Motif scaffolding. Structure first.
Motif, mmCIF file in Angstrom:
data_model
loop_
_atom_site.group_PDB
_atom_site.id
_atom_site.type_symbol
_atom_site.label_atom_id
_atom_site.label_comp_id
_atom_site.label_asym_id
_atom_site.label_seq_id
_atom_site.Cartn_x
_atom_site.Cartn_y
_atom_site.Cartn_z
ATOM 1 N N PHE A 1 0.844 -1.183 0.000
ATOM 2 C CA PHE A 1 0.000 0.000 0.000
ATOM 3 C C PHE A 1 0.880 1.234 0.000
ATOM 4 C CE2 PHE A 1 -3.868 -2.240 1.165
ATOM 5 C CZ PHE A 1 -3.386 -3.358 1.814
ATOM 6 N N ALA A 2 0.606 2.145 -0.922
ATOM 7 C CA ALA A 2 1.360 3.376 -1.020
ATOM 8 C C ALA A 2 0.458 4.466 -1.575
ATOM 9 C CB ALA A 2 2.574 3.192 -1.917
ATOM 10 N N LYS A 3 0.928 5.700 -1.484
ATOM 11 C CA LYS A 3 0.211 6.826 -2.039
ATOM 12 C C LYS A 3 1.169 7.640 -2.884
ATOM 13 C CE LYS A 3 -2.806 8.906 0.577
ATOM 14 N NZ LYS A 3 -3.605 9.465 1.707
ATOM 15 N N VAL A 4 0.632 8.280 -3.918
ATOM 16 C CA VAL A 4 1.429 9.061 -4.849
ATOM 17 C C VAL A 4 2.431 9.955 -4.117
ATOM 18 C CG1 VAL A 4 1.335 10.652 -6.819
ATOM 19 C CG2 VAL A 4 -0.551 9.073 -6.412
ATOM 20 N N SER A 5 2.098 10.322 -2.884
ATOM 21 C CA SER A 5 2.904 11.244 -2.099
ATOM 22 C C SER A 5 4.019 10.522 -1.354
ATOM 23 C CB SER A 5 2.021 11.974 -1.091
ATOM 24 O OG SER A 5 1.499 11.060 -0.145
ATOM 25 N N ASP A 6 4.073 9.202 -1.512
ATOM 26 C CA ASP A 6 5.157 8.404 -0.950
ATOM 27 C C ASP A 6 6.278 8.239 -1.970
ATOM 28 O OD1 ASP A 6 4.164 7.958 1.643
ATOM 29 O OD2 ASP A 6 2.911 6.290 0.969
ATOM 30 N N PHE A 7 6.050 8.715 -3.189
ATOM 31 C CA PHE A 7 7.050 8.628 -4.251
ATOM 32 C C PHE A 7 8.064 9.756 -4.149
ATOM 33 C CE2 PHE A 7 5.708 5.476 -7.503
ATOM 34 C CZ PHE A 7 4.624 4.970 -6.806
ATOM 35 N N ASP A 8 9.317 9.454 -4.479
ATOM 36 C CA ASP A 8 10.377 10.455 -4.447
ATOM 37 C C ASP A 8 10.373 11.323 -5.703
ATOM 38 O OD1 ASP A 8 12.706 11.905 -3.800
ATOM 39 O OD2 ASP A 8 13.943 10.488 -4.923
ATOM 40 N N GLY A 9 9.643 12.430 -5.666
ATOM 41 C CA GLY A 9 9.586 13.310 -6.818
ATOM 42 C C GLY A 9 9.022 12.611 -8.040
ATOM 43 N N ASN A 10 9.736 12.699 -9.158
ATOM 44 C CA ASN A 10 9.285 12.076 -10.396
ATOM 45 C C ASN A 10 10.049 10.795 -10.742
ATOM 46 O OD1 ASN A 10 7.489 11.971 -12.547
ATOM 47 N ND2 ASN A 10 8.810 13.178 -13.913
ATOM 48 N N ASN A 11 10.791 10.268 -9.772
ATOM 49 C CA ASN A 11 11.564 9.048 -9.978
ATOM 50 C C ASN A 11 10.753 7.800 -9.703
ATOM 51 O OD1 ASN A 11 14.131 10.482 -10.410
ATOM 52 N ND2 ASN A 11 13.936 10.980 -8.222
ATOM 53 N N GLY A 12 11.199 6.680 -10.259
ATOM 54 C CA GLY A 12 10.598 5.397 -9.952
ATOM 55 C C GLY A 12 11.075 4.914 -8.598
ATOM 56 N N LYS A 13 10.785 5.697 -7.564
ATOM 57 C CA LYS A 13 11.238 5.369 -6.221
ATOM 58 C C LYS A 13 10.196 5.770 -5.189
ATOM 59 C CE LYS A 13 15.038 6.346 -2.967
ATOM 60 N NZ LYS A 13 15.066 4.931 -2.474
ATOM 61 N N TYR A 14 9.913 4.858 -4.264
ATOM 62 C CA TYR A 14 8.906 5.108 -3.247
ATOM 63 C C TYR A 14 8.998 4.144 -2.072
ATOM 64 C CZ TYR A 14 6.295 1.212 -5.363
ATOM 65 O OH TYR A 14 5.900 -0.023 -5.845
ATOM 66 N N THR A 15 8.299 4.488 -1.002
ATOM 67 C CA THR A 15 8.197 3.620 0.155
ATOM 68 C C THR A 15 6.776 3.087 0.238
ATOM 69 O OG1 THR A 15 9.751 5.096 1.302
ATOM 70 C CG2 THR A 15 8.686 3.389 2.607
ATOM 71 N N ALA A 16 6.647 1.830 0.624
ATOM 72 C CA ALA A 16 5.347 1.218 0.749
ATOM 73 C C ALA A 16 5.226 0.507 2.080
ATOM 74 C CB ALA A 16 5.115 0.251 -0.390
ATOM 75 N N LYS A 17 3.992 0.396 2.557
ATOM 76 C CA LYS A 17 3.686 -0.491 3.664
ATOM 77 C C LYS A 17 3.270 -1.823 3.057
ATOM 78 C CE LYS A 17 2.760 -1.157 7.835
ATOM 79 N NZ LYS A 17 3.104 0.276 8.038
ATOM 80 N N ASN A 18 4.084 -2.851 3.258
ATOM 81 C CA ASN A 18 3.770 -4.156 2.708
ATOM 82 C C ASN A 18 3.259 -5.103 3.791
ATOM 83 O OD1 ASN A 18 4.989 -7.139 2.032
ATOM 84 N ND2 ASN A 18 4.061 -6.173 0.232
ATOM 85 N N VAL A 19 2.081 -5.659 3.548
ATOM 86 C CA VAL A 19 1.415 -6.516 4.508
ATOM 87 C C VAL A 19 1.309 -7.953 4.001
ATOM 88 C CG1 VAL A 19 -0.681 -6.849 5.887
ATOM 89 C CG2 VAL A 19 0.080 -4.549 5.271
ATOM 90 N N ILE A 20 1.852 -8.892 4.768
ATOM 91 C CA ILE A 20 1.661 -10.307 4.469
ATOM 92 C C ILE A 20 0.305 -10.760 5.013
ATOM 93 C CG2 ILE A 20 2.519 -12.640 4.774
ATOM 94 C CD1 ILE A 20 5.333 -11.488 4.889
ATOM 95 N N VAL A 21 -0.489 -11.379 4.146
ATOM 96 C CA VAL A 21 -1.881 -11.675 4.447
ATOM 97 C C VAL A 21 -2.219 -13.106 4.074
ATOM 98 C CG1 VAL A 21 -2.598 -9.304 3.997
ATOM 99 C CG2 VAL A 21 -2.634 -11.001 2.129
ATOM 100 N N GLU A 22 -3.325 -13.595 4.627
ATOM 101 C CA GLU A 22 -3.896 -14.876 4.248
ATOM 102 C C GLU A 22 -4.764 -14.678 3.013
ATOM 103 O OE1 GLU A 22 -2.999 -17.146 6.733
ATOM 104 O OE2 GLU A 22 -3.853 -16.507 8.653
#
Length: 195
Positions: A74-95
């Motif tokens: 899960f991420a939001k456009v505002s988690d991206f570093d400017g216009n680069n292909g770089k970002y942080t996400a919250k990744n959840v392992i699920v059933e």
């Protein structure tokens, strides 16, 4: 030490990237020799919605154990570093049903992509840097022959060669992908992670 910083795709087109699905064809996971438990067939679906949310659902299938694992970034456009292909996400392992098993933060770095065929990514957990992943990704189950060199250049940037990665396409004839769950979890609401 910790998570490596790698140069990333300039002028990242989110709208053309975060659509449809991808297959993970080749990858290196951590520093150790790959064990059979880490030899998986991964397909993911994602989407970017008008509200600016980015969502990615992974189906990881281990042919040796005939088991699936699932995770969702899960991420939001505002988690991206400017216009680069770089970002942080919250990744959840699920059933299968989306119940939370574990969660972590991932830094995602797209080293390269042409959007319609292939992408090359580095993924790393800033709190578990020994879990890093360099992966080749394709819109089809195999990377299309005519981009194999365009891919190998990208890996070049990060000190790697295709033959230096686990070829997940050696599993192929046994690979399975849980499209039902993929579709269901993409549509499914996750109020603990949306926002």
């Amino acid at each position: 030490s910790g998570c490596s910083t790698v140069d990333t795709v300039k002028d990242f087109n989110k709208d053309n990237f975060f659509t449809g699905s991808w297959y993970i064809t080749h990858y290196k996971l951590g520093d150790s020799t790959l064990e059979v438990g880490d030899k998986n067939c991964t397909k993911f679906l994602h989407q970017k919605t008008a509200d600016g949310k980015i969502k990615e659902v992974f189906s990881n299938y281990n042919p040796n154990a005939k088991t699936y694992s699932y995770d969702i970034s899960f991420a939001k456009v505002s988690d991206f570093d400017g216009n680069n292909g770089k970002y942080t996400a919250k990744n959840v392992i699920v059933e299968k049903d989306g119940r939370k098993i574990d969660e972590r933060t991932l830094q995602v770095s797209y080293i390269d992509t042409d959007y319609s065929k292939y992408s090359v990514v580095h993924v790393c957990d800033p709190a578990a840097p020994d879990y890093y992943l360099y992966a080749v990704q394709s819109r089809t189950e195999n990377v299309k022959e005519d981009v194999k060199s365009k891919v190998e250049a990208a890996l070049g940037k990060v000190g790697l060669k295709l033959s230096g990665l686990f070829d997940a396409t050696t599993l192929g004839n046994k690979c399975q992908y849980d499209d039902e769950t993929l579709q269901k979890l993409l549509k499914q609401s996750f109020p603990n992670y949306e926002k």
